[PDB]
Amino acid sequence: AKILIVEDEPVVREAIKRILEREGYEVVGEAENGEEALKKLKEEKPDLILTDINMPGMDGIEVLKKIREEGLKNTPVIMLTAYGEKEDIVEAFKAGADGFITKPFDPEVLKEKIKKVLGS
């Protein structure tokens, strides 16, 4: 499976990338902001997008909404937080998130949730 990561914090971004790769996933892009997210969505046609809930400018829910507006087939989105930020769980699921991960640095939890969403 091909994964696009949307995460503004560079070291967190790289850690997630490497964890995905250790779990056998192809990381087909890394986006630091919404502009890059939407550009790489169209260029790479990922099987799944992982998006931080909290990013500068256009926040994770707004990125999610724009991804869902593009309406490309098989573009599930899982939200994540690197800091236990759970305040926007509702708004993410209401806006069409397929999942919301609070333990993104546990390779097994990440793989389990991706596998589930991809299978659904």
PDB file of N, CA and C in Angstrom, residues 8-49:
ATOM      1  N   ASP A   8       3.556  18.737   9.618  1.00  0.00           N
ATOM      2  CA  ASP A   8       4.430  19.885   9.500  1.00  0.00           C
ATOM      3  C   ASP A   8       5.733  19.712  10.259  1.00  0.00           C
ATOM      4  N   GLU A   9       5.734  18.928  11.352  1.00  0.00           N
ATOM      5  CA  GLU A   9       6.939  18.824  12.193  1.00  0.00           C
ATOM      6  C   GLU A   9       7.910  17.838  11.544  1.00  0.00           C
ATOM      7  N   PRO A  10       9.124  18.241  11.151  1.00  0.00           N
ATOM      8  CA  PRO A  10       9.959  17.420  10.293  1.00  0.00           C
ATOM      9  C   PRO A  10      10.439  16.123  10.922  1.00  0.00           C
ATOM     10  N   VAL A  11      10.809  16.158  12.208  1.00  0.00           N
ATOM     11  CA  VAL A  11      11.361  14.974  12.828  1.00  0.00           C
ATOM     12  C   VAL A  11      10.248  13.966  13.084  1.00  0.00           C
ATOM     13  N   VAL A  12       9.071  14.434  13.481  1.00  0.00           N
ATOM     14  CA  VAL A  12       7.906  13.574  13.640  1.00  0.00           C
ATOM     15  C   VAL A  12       7.553  12.983  12.290  1.00  0.00           C
ATOM     16  N   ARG A  13       7.551  13.779  11.223  1.00  0.00           N
ATOM     17  CA  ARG A  13       7.271  13.308   9.863  1.00  0.00           C
ATOM     18  C   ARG A  13       8.201  12.165   9.463  1.00  0.00           C
ATOM     19  N   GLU A  14       9.491  12.369   9.701  1.00  0.00           N
ATOM     20  CA  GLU A  14      10.471  11.343   9.340  1.00  0.00           C
ATOM     21  C   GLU A  14      10.293  10.084  10.170  1.00  0.00           C
ATOM     22  N   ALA A  15       9.986  10.211  11.454  1.00  0.00           N
ATOM     23  CA  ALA A  15       9.765   9.055  12.295  1.00  0.00           C
ATOM     24  C   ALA A  15       8.579   8.255  11.775  1.00  0.00           C
ATOM     25  N   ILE A  16       7.482   8.914  11.447  1.00  0.00           N
ATOM     26  CA  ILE A  16       6.309   8.212  10.928  1.00  0.00           C
ATOM     27  C   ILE A  16       6.647   7.516   9.613  1.00  0.00           C
ATOM     28  N   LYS A  17       7.337   8.190   8.709  1.00  0.00           N
ATOM     29  CA  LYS A  17       7.775   7.657   7.433  1.00  0.00           C
ATOM     30  C   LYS A  17       8.537   6.349   7.652  1.00  0.00           C
ATOM     31  N   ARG A  18       9.519   6.404   8.561  1.00  0.00           N
ATOM     32  CA  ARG A  18      10.396   5.264   8.790  1.00  0.00           C
ATOM     33  C   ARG A  18       9.616   4.115   9.413  1.00  0.00           C
ATOM     34  N   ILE A  19       8.690   4.396  10.365  1.00  0.00           N
ATOM     35  CA  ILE A  19       7.848   3.364  10.949  1.00  0.00           C
ATOM     36  C   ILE A  19       6.988   2.690   9.907  1.00  0.00           C
ATOM     37  N   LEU A  20       6.365   3.473   9.029  1.00  0.00           N
ATOM     38  CA  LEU A  20       5.585   2.908   7.918  1.00  0.00           C
ATOM     39  C   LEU A  20       6.429   1.984   7.031  1.00  0.00           C
ATOM     40  N   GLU A  21       7.622   2.417   6.704  1.00  0.00           N
ATOM     41  CA  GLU A  21       8.543   1.650   5.870  1.00  0.00           C
ATOM     42  C   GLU A  21       8.979   0.365   6.585  1.00  0.00           C
ATOM     43  N   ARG A  22       9.256   0.436   7.891  1.00  0.00           N
ATOM     44  CA  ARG A  22       9.576  -0.769   8.668  1.00  0.00           C
ATOM     45  C   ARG A  22       8.425  -1.772   8.691  1.00  0.00           C
ATOM     46  N   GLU A  23       7.196  -1.285   8.521  1.00  0.00           N
ATOM     47  CA  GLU A  23       6.008  -2.118   8.499  1.00  0.00           C
ATOM     48  C   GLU A  23       5.627  -2.520   7.097  1.00  0.00           C
ATOM     49  N   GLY A  24       6.473  -2.218   6.115  1.00  0.00           N
ATOM     50  CA  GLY A  24       6.299  -2.741   4.765  1.00  0.00           C
ATOM     51  C   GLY A  24       5.466  -1.871   3.825  1.00  0.00           C
ATOM     52  N   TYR A  25       5.195  -0.623   4.243  1.00  0.00           N
ATOM     53  CA  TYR A  25       4.450   0.297   3.393  1.00  0.00           C
ATOM     54  C   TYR A  25       5.370   1.188   2.578  1.00  0.00           C
ATOM     55  N   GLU A  26       4.929   1.537   1.367  1.00  0.00           N
ATOM     56  CA  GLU A  26       5.596   2.507   0.527  1.00  0.00           C
ATOM     57  C   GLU A  26       5.099   3.902   0.896  1.00  0.00           C
ATOM     58  N   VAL A  27       6.009   4.814   1.249  1.00  0.00           N
ATOM     59  CA  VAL A  27       5.631   6.190   1.528  1.00  0.00           C
ATOM     60  C   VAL A  27       5.874   6.955   0.246  1.00  0.00           C
ATOM     61  N   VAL A  28       4.784   7.417  -0.380  1.00  0.00           N
ATOM     62  CA  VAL A  28       4.901   7.996  -1.709  1.00  0.00           C
ATOM     63  C   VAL A  28       4.954   9.510  -1.659  1.00  0.00           C
ATOM     64  N   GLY A  29       4.756  10.103  -0.490  1.00  0.00           N
ATOM     65  CA  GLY A  29       4.982  11.531  -0.361  1.00  0.00           C
ATOM     66  C   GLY A  29       4.925  11.971   1.085  1.00  0.00           C
ATOM     67  N   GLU A  30       5.526  13.113   1.307  1.00  0.00           N
ATOM     68  CA  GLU A  30       5.598  13.785   2.572  1.00  0.00           C
ATOM     69  C   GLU A  30       5.202  15.240   2.317  1.00  0.00           C
ATOM     70  N   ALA A  31       4.131  15.664   2.938  1.00  0.00           N
ATOM     71  CA  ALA A  31       3.622  17.026   2.779  1.00  0.00           C
ATOM     72  C   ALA A  31       3.703  17.769   4.092  1.00  0.00           C
ATOM     73  N   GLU A  32       4.239  19.001   4.078  1.00  0.00           N
ATOM     74  CA  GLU A  32       4.367  19.789   5.298  1.00  0.00           C
ATOM     75  C   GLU A  32       3.208  20.760   5.514  1.00  0.00           C
ATOM     76  N   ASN A  33       2.306  20.893   4.530  1.00  0.00           N
ATOM     77  CA  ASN A  33       1.211  21.852   4.591  1.00  0.00           C
ATOM     78  C   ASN A  33       0.115  21.359   3.645  1.00  0.00           C
ATOM     79  N   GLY A  34      -1.021  22.043   3.644  1.00  0.00           N
ATOM     80  CA  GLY A  34      -2.160  21.647   2.857  1.00  0.00           C
ATOM     81  C   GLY A  34      -1.919  21.760   1.355  1.00  0.00           C
ATOM     82  N   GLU A  35      -1.228  22.801   0.918  1.00  0.00           N
ATOM     83  CA  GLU A  35      -0.907  22.922  -0.494  1.00  0.00           C
ATOM     84  C   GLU A  35      -0.166  21.683  -0.994  1.00  0.00           C
ATOM     85  N   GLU A  36       0.872  21.278  -0.277  1.00  0.00           N
ATOM     86  CA  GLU A  36       1.622  20.105  -0.693  1.00  0.00           C
ATOM     87  C   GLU A  36       0.765  18.849  -0.588  1.00  0.00           C
ATOM     88  N   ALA A  37      -0.078  18.766   0.431  1.00  0.00           N
ATOM     89  CA  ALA A  37      -0.934  17.601   0.593  1.00  0.00           C
ATOM     90  C   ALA A  37      -1.790  17.375  -0.641  1.00  0.00           C
ATOM     91  N   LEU A  38      -2.435  18.439  -1.105  1.00  0.00           N
ATOM     92  CA  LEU A  38      -3.377  18.314  -2.205  1.00  0.00           C
ATOM     93  C   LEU A  38      -2.632  18.094  -3.518  1.00  0.00           C
ATOM     94  N   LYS A  39      -1.445  18.679  -3.682  1.00  0.00           N
ATOM     95  CA  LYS A  39      -0.617  18.465  -4.867  1.00  0.00           C
ATOM     96  C   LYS A  39      -0.174  17.001  -4.935  1.00  0.00           C
ATOM     97  N   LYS A  40       0.281  16.449  -3.806  1.00  0.00           N
ATOM     98  CA  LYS A  40       0.796  15.085  -3.793  1.00  0.00           C
ATOM     99  C   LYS A  40      -0.351  14.080  -3.855  1.00  0.00           C
ATOM    100  N   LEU A  41      -1.532  14.396  -3.330  1.00  0.00           N
ATOM    101  CA  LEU A  41      -2.702  13.538  -3.468  1.00  0.00           C
ATOM    102  C   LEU A  41      -2.955  13.308  -4.966  1.00  0.00           C
ATOM    103  N   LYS A  42      -2.983  14.390  -5.730  1.00  0.00           N
ATOM    104  CA  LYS A  42      -3.298  14.292  -7.155  1.00  0.00           C
ATOM    105  C   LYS A  42      -2.179  13.620  -7.945  1.00  0.00           C
ATOM    106  N   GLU A  43      -0.925  13.893  -7.602  1.00  0.00           N
ATOM    107  CA  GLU A  43       0.228  13.353  -8.321  1.00  0.00           C
ATOM    108  C   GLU A  43       0.407  11.863  -8.043  1.00  0.00           C
ATOM    109  N   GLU A  44       0.244  11.461  -6.782  1.00  0.00           N
ATOM    110  CA  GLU A  44       0.647  10.129  -6.347  1.00  0.00           C
ATOM    111  C   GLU A  44      -0.519   9.152  -6.200  1.00  0.00           C
ATOM    112  N   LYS A  45      -1.755   9.632  -6.096  1.00  0.00           N
ATOM    113  CA  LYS A  45      -2.907   8.765  -5.914  1.00  0.00           C
ATOM    114  C   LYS A  45      -2.623   7.701  -4.861  1.00  0.00           C
ATOM    115  N   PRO A  46      -2.333   8.127  -3.616  1.00  0.00           N
ATOM    116  CA  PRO A  46      -2.068   7.210  -2.525  1.00  0.00           C
ATOM    117  C   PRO A  46      -3.280   6.368  -2.182  1.00  0.00           C
ATOM    118  N   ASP A  47      -3.002   5.201  -1.625  1.00  0.00           N
ATOM    119  CA  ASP A  47      -4.044   4.347  -1.097  1.00  0.00           C
ATOM    120  C   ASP A  47      -4.617   4.818   0.243  1.00  0.00           C
ATOM    121  N   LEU A  48      -3.828   5.606   0.983  1.00  0.00           N
ATOM    122  CA  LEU A  48      -4.258   6.136   2.275  1.00  0.00           C
ATOM    123  C   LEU A  48      -3.437   7.374   2.577  1.00  0.00           C
ATOM    124  N   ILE A  49      -4.078   8.338   3.265  1.00  0.00           N
ATOM    125  CA  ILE A  49      -3.415   9.542   3.709  1.00  0.00           C
ATOM    126  C   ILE A  49      -3.465   9.594   5.225  1.00  0.00           C
TER     127      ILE A  49
END
